[PDB]
Structures are given as structure tokens and as C-alpha cells.
Amino acid sequence: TSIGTGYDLSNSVFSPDGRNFQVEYAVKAVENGTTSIGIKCNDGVVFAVEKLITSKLLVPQKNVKIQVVDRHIGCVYSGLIPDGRHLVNRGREEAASFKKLYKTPIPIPAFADRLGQYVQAHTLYNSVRPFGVSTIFGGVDKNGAHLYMLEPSGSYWGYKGAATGKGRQSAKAELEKLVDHHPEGLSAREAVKQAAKIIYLAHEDKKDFELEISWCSLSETNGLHKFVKGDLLQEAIDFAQKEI
């Protein structure tokens, strides 16, 4: 019953079972995207992305897949690229407005709620369609580290570890194993290495690929979102290859 005929040609229509099929089709679109993961460490977050190898013609420093929403908020997404870009633009606008109005960086839950309201508002009318992206975002605020995942329906939750894309199942299995093996918690460098390992494990789709890791931690990056430097990135890649 994954195809509802007679109720899947308009955005704001309920089926006899109370389902909205266009939102589920947007979920299907998300499920065919690139694998993206997020891990919550002791005092920060780490995001990791698998990216296909493109031609040498592209400028190496202008091809970044992990968007920086704010000095303390990082974001990755899986699905349609333009929708994700639009959503990141709206998130940056919201963060800028909140910081201007209240003189402080926006707390992660408030940002998540504003994004979720904006996404949910696109399931109300037949003249628009739901966003075709699932977004994993996170950051550090005065209450600590936060990691959230947001869906095309406007539903979002806070996670210990989140995964999306084609290789979501293996990534979720490895994240559950990582949570089980570390009940006490996890440090930032361990999170970086484990994210590299998980991306490498889930990369089996067949095909050359690259790993992009970013992190935001209070002890390491002073509560700022920074990309993992060359030495640490190479160490993570080597550790992931040795794991396999």
C-alpha cells in the first residue's frame, strides 16, 4: 500500500487511511539521495558526508557539501539540491534575524522549530509541494550540543545519531552499535573517526568516493563549526580503511 491511487495527485489531500501521499513520495525522493550522517559527541556534533568524485574541471575549494548555517550551526541534507539550498538560505535568514533581535546566537531548538514550521507550512495547500530534502543539522548553545533531523512532513527530532540517504540502513545499524558500545559517551576525535568508518562501511554502492567531515565542539573548536583539517581528515580516512 505504498502507492495510493486517487489520493496522490494533490498536496493537501487525506487518504481514507489518513495518509498524505505526496509527502511520502518526497520521502521516497529523499531515500535516493547521498548518504549523510551526524553523531553527537560529549560536547559537540560531527557531520559526515559521502560525495561522488567529479571531474578535475571543478574548483577544489568551491565544492563543499557541508553547509554552515551559522558560526555555531552546521547542516547537511539528502534529497533535491535546490530545495536543500533554499532551506539553508531560510535557516541563515532566521539565525541572522534572531541574533539581531536578541543579541545572542539562536538556540538550536528554536532554530529547529522555525525550520520545522516553515517546512510544515508547505503541506497545507495544493499550489505548493513539500520539500524533497531531509536535513541533519546541529550545533552548540548555552545548554550544550544539539543534533536534529528534519523531514519533508515538517517533523523533526533530536538524535544521538542520525543518518539519511541511500545507505541509511547500514549507517543507522552502525550508529546503534556505536551508541551501545559507548554508554558513557564519546569524544570529538573518536566521533570523527567513527563517522569516517561509518561512511566507508555504507559507501558500498558501486565507485570512487570522497569523505567530508566537519565538527563543532566546545573544547576543540571553541563552540564553532569548522571543517576537519588535512591531517585529521587523512588520519580518519586511514583508520576507516584499516577498519574495513
Binding site: 486517487g6 489520493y7 494533490s10 489531500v13 487525506f14 487518504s15 481514507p16 487511511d17 489518513g18 495518509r19 495544493n126
Partner: peptide, 24 residues
Amino acid sequence: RHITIFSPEGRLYQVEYAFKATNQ
């Protein structure tokens, strides 16, 4: 089946389907 109008029996099916959604 898209919009809230009367069926020949005098019902509004979209409202009932929203009721069905309430229990998901």
C-alpha cells in the same frame, strides 16, 4: 475526495479522513 464538499449521503469525507489521521 480532494475538497470538503457534501457526498450524496451528506458526509464530508476529508473530515473523516482527518479523524483517521488523528490516530496514526
